[PDB]
Design a protein around this nucleic acid. Sequence first.
RNA 1: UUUUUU
RNA 2: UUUUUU
RNA 3: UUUUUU
RNA 4: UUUUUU
RNA 5: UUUUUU
RNA 6: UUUUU
RNA 7: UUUUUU
Lengths: 72, 71, 71, 71, 71, 71, 71, 71, 71, 71, 71, 71, 71, 71
Amino acid sequence: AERPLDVIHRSLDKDVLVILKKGFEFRGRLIGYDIHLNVVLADAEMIQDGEVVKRYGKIVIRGDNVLAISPT
Amino acid sequence: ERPLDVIHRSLDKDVLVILKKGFEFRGRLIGYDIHLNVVLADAEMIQDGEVVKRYGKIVIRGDNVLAISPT
Amino acid sequence: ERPLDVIHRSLDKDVLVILKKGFEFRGRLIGYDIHLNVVLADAEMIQDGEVVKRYGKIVIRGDNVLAISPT
Amino acid sequence: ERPLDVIHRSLDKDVLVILKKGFEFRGRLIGYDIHLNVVLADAEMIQDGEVVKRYGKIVIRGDNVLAISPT
Amino acid sequence: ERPLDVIHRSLDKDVLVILKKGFEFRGRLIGYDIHLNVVLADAEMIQDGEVVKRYGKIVIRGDNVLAISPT
Amino acid sequence: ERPLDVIHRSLDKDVLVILKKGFEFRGRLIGYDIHLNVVLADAEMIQDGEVVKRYGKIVIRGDNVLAISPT
Amino acid sequence: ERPLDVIHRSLDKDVLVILKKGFEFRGRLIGYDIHLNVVLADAEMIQDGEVVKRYGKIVIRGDNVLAISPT
Amino acid sequence: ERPLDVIHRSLDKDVLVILKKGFEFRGRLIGYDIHLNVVLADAEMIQDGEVVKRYGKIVIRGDNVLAISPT
Amino acid sequence: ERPLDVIHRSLDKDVLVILKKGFEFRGRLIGYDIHLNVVLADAEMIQDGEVVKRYGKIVIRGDNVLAISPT
Amino acid sequence: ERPLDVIHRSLDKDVLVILKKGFEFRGRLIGYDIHLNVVLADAEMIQDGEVVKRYGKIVIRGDNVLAISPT
Amino acid sequence: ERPLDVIHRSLDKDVLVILKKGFEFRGRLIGYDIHLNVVLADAEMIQDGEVVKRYGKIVIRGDNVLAISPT
Amino acid sequence: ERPLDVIHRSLDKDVLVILKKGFEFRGRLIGYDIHLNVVLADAEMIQDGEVVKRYGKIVIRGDNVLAISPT
Amino acid sequence: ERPLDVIHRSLDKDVLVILKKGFEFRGRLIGYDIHLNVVLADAEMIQDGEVVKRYGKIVIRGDNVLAISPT
Amino acid sequence: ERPLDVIHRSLDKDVLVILKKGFEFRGRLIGYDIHLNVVLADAEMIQDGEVVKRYGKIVIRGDNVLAISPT
RNA sequence: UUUUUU
RNA sequence: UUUUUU
RNA sequence: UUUUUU
RNA sequence: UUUUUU
RNA sequence: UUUUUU
RNA sequence: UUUUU
RNA sequence: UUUUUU
Ligand SMILES: [Ca+2]
Ligand SMILES: [Ca+2]
Ligand SMILES: [Ca+2]
Ligand SMILES: [Ca+2]
Ligand SMILES: [Ca+2]
Ligand SMILES: [Ca+2]
Ligand SMILES: [Ca+2]
C-alpha cells in the first residue's frame, strides 16, 4: 500500500506544495521528477512567510533541498 | 525488530515523525521506502505542541527525519 | 570488539544514544541496521540531564547519531 | 517534463541557477552533467536583485544548486 | 603508513578522537571499521580540556570524526 | 561544453575557485579529478578582494567548491 | 599534476592541511588514501596563527579537509 | 514493447520457453523477475515435439532461456 | 553509429537476428533493452534458408545473440 | 508468484532440481540464497530415471540449475 | 595503443572482426561501445577464406569477439 | 539452513566437492569465500570411484563447482 | 611482482598470448586494460607450431586469454 | 585458512595450477590478484604427466583455473 | 520514472 | 543483522 | 565513446 | 593503466 | 594484495 | 531470505 | 530506451 514515488507519480500534472529545508516553499504544477526526488514545476510561485515573493514559468528543483512534497 | 520491521508494521497506524529541523509531523503512515522517505495521511505539522499546519497527504524526504515513533 | 559487534551484542539491553544535534536517548535496544539506524523500546529523550519525553518505541535514523553506549 | 529533459532543452538558452547559499546566477546554459553541475557563459552573480560580478564562463557544482529556471 | 594501517596498529592502545563539533573522546581503541566508526573502552568525553563524562564502552559513528591520534 | 570539458581546457591557465565558505583561490589550474578536486600553482587565497595568503601549489578538495571560472 | 599525484608525491614531505573549520595542521605527510584521509607525523594544530596542540602521529578524516599544500 | 513489457503482459497467459539446450517448456506464466527467471504452471516439457514430462509448477533459471513467446 | 543507435533506429523495421547457437530469426523489431534482449513480431526461425518456425511475438535473451542486422 | 516466492514457499517440502548437465536431484529443500544456490536434505542424484546416489545434505551451486520444481 | 584507443582511431576505417566461433567479419567500423560491441557497414562474413554473406550494416555483440584488427 | 550456513558448519570436517567438470574431490574443509571457492586439506581427486591423486592442501575455484556435500 | 605489474613491464616487448581456443599469438605488446584485453603490433597467429597468419596491429579480447608470457 | 590466505602464503613457492582445459602448469608463484590471476616464474606446462613447454614467467587468467595446490 | 515492466 | 554464514 | 573530458 | 597516485 | 590494514 | 521489512 | 536527458 501507497509509497513515496506513487503519490508523486500520481500527482503528475496536478498542483503540489514543495517545502524546502531552508525555510521557504514553492507551489505549482508538478510536471516531472526523478529517482533523486528532483521535481519540475510549471507556473510555480516561491512562497515565503505566506507571501508569493516570486514566480517562474518552469523551474527544476534539486531534491536534496526538499523537505517534503504535498499534493493540493 | 529492525527499523524497517517497525516501520512496515506501522502502516495504516498513527506515527510521529521527528524531523531534525526542530518540528515534527503527526499522521497516518501509508507508505515508505529504503531511504526512509515516509508518507502520511491526515498529517499535522506540529511546532511546540502546536498544530500550526495540516495536510491531506504528505511525502517527507527521509534525510530530514530524526526519528519515527508509532503511536 | 567492532562497532557492529558491540551494538549487536547490546540487543535487548540498555544503551545511550548520543545525537550530534544536542540531546540523547536512553532505552532498551531492540533493533538496528547496517546504516546504524536503531530501534529503542521504552525510550526517554534527554536534554541537559532530564527526561523531556518518552516513547514506547522509536526508530532513530543512524544519520543523526554521534555515538551509542551500552550502559 | 523530467528534470534533465528541461535542462537539456535549455542548452544555449538563458537560465537562472538559484543557489542554496542565498544568491543566484543568470547566464546562457552551455553545459551540464548528471550531477547537475552546470556551465554558464556571460553570467552574472545576482545578490539582492543586483549584479555583483560577471563571468564569461563559469562551472557550478550541482552540489550548491537549489533550482534552475529556464529563461 | 596509510590511514587504516595506523588505526589498525592502535588496537588496544590509547587514542584521541577529535570530533567535528568541538569536543573529543579519549580512550582505548578496541575496534573499528571502514567508515571509521571506532569503539573505545574506559572512555571519557573531553570538552575544552576537561572530562565531562565517562563511558566504559562507546561506539562513535565515524562520520563525526575529525581526527584520531594514537597517544 | 560539459563541466569537465571546460575544466580540462583550463589546464595551465588561470582560474578562479569560488568556495562555499566565502573566499576564493586564484591560480594556474594544473590538475583535477572526477570529484572536481583541483590543483593550483602560484595560488592566492583571496578574502575580500584582497590577497590574504599564497601557496606555490595547493590541492583543493572538490567538496568545498561552489564554482570554478576561467579568467 | 593530478590531486593524488601531488599528494602521493608529498609522501614523507612537509605539508599543511587546511580544514574547513578554520584551523590547519602542519606536519610531515606519511600516508593517505583515496578518501583524502591523511596521516601526519610530528604534527601541530594551528589556530589564528598559533600552535595549539602537537601530535606524534595523526590520522585526519579527509571529509574535513579544504586543501592540502606541499611545504 | 520492451522485452519485460511483453513478459509482464503474459502473466496468467500461455507462453513458450525455448531453452538453449534444445528443448522447451510450455505453460502458464505465473511470475518472473529481472534475471528473466520464469515460473510456469501446468507446464509440459517438450522434446522434438513430444511432451516428455509435466510439472504443475516450475521455476526456470532465465540463464537457460533463449526465448519466450506468448501463444 | 553506435550499437544501440542502430538498434534504436531499427524499431518497427525488419531485422535479422543471428544467434550464437547456429541459426537466426527474422522479423520486425518492436523492442529491446541494454542487455540486448530484443522483441520481434511476425518472426521466422530460419535454418539454412528455410522457415522452420513462426512466432507472432518472441522475446530473445540478448545473451544468445551473435549479431543483429537491419532490413 | 515470483521465482523466489515459489522457492521460499517450498522450504521443507520435496522438490526436483533439474541441472543443466542432464541429470537431477530430488530432495527436501531446506535452504537457499539469491544466487539460486539451494540446499537439500535426504537427496538423490537421478539419471535416466534411477537413483544413482544419495546424500544426507547437499548444497548445489545455483549456476548449474536449469529448473526447480516443487513436489 | 590501448584497446579502445586503437578501436576508436579505426572509426570509419576497415577492420577485421575475428569471432570466437568459426569465422570473421570484415568491413568499415562506424560505431562501438564499452562492451566492445562493434558496428560494421558494408560487412562480409568470411569463412575458410571465402565470403559467405554481405550485410549493409550489422551490430556484433562484443562477447562473440575474439579479436579486432585494423586493416 | 542456507547454502553458506551448511558450508560454514563444515569447517574442519569432511566434505565432497562434485565438480561440474566431470570428476570430484574429497577432503577436509578448511576454508571458503563468497564465490564458493573452497580450500581442502588431505584432498583426494576421485574419478569413477578411484582416487587418482592426492593433495596436501588444494584451493578450488568456485565456478568449477557443481555441489558440495558434508560427509 | 603482480599480474598487471608483469604486463605493464612487458609494454613494447615481445610476448606470447596463449588463447583458450587453443592457438596462440606472438607479438609486441603495445597496450592493455583491466579486463586484460591486449594490443599487439606485428602479430603472428601461431597454430600447431605454424605461423598461419599475420596482422600489423590487433586487439585481443582478454576474455579469450588463457595466459600471457613475456619473451 | 581462506582461499586467498593459502594463496598469499604460497608466494615465492612452488605450486601447481590445474587448469580446467585439462592440462596443468607448475612453477614458483610470484604474484596474484583478487580475480585469481596468478603469476609463475620458471614454469612448466604439464600435459598428461609430461613437460610440454617451459616459461621463464607466465601470467595466467584466473578464469581458466580449476584449482591451485602448494607443492 | 512509481505500477516486478530493466 | 556484526560472527567468512550472502 | 578512448584522449582525465563524467 | 601496474606503482595507494582515482 | 589475503591478515579489519581501504 | 521471497513478502517495500 | 541510444540521442548528455537519469
Ligand atoms: Ca517500475
Ligand atoms: Ca555476517
Ligand atoms: Ca574519456
Ligand atoms: Ca594505480
Ligand atoms: Ca586486507
Ligand atoms: Ca524482503
Ligand atoms: Ca539517453
